[PDB]
Design a protein around this ligand. Sequence first.
Ligand code: 5N2
Ligand code: ZN
Length: 208
Amino acid sequence: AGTILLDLAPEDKEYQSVEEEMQSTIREHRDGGNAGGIFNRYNVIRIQKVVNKKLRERFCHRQKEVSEENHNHHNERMLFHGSPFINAIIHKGFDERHAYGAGIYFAENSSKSNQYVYGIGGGTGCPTHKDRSCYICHRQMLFCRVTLGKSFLQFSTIKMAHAPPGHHSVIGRPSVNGLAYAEYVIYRGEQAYPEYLITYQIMKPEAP
Ligand SMILES: N#Cc1cccnc1N1CCN(C(=O)c2cccc(Cc3n[nH]c(=O)c4ccccc34)c2)CC1
Ligand SMILES: [Zn+2]
């Protein structure tokens, strides 16, 4: 469907709120930066608002259904999503049929989503230099509206095909000797809208 990308100005409070969420949710991973690279900050290049009529209709229709089922609590959250398929998502929307557990995954930590931008485990890194820690190539991630409804809380790895009865999402919570970062899972593509398209670089730490 026909998508319009609206550029946000760095002086706008909306652009600043998105950047602040992205910068403040960075964590150090157990990985040592193997999947996403070594950095403590991003360089934000562009923040674009995604406008798609058909995707907004599917999203709003699903949100109303979830709110009705969950005593008027749709429990919407803004969460990050990193993937090599950003172009398909902003035009056709999120699709659970591509998941390959089996649901659509989001993170509350931008650094978690950054590990998936080039593929699982960071794939082979950027197309040009084949570098998972590339400081040059422009990466993209989404900051999405996610309809969570009633969330089912667990510590184990999410090995479910659908949300349990009475629930609309699954949350994998960090625990000592378990997950390092929280994972948010939905099983219907209509329960996420790709609101913001963020273009950025990971920054190389200063030399002592
Ligand atoms: N839609 C569509 C689509 C179209 C064309 C091709 N692949 C499409 N997929 C692949 C499937 N999907 C997923 O979300 C997924 C499924 C399994 C694993 C991951 C990894 C993942 N990634 N990113 C994140 O921020 C994150 C955050 C927390 C945990 C794990 C993760 C993600 C949905 C998107
Ligand atoms: Zn590169």
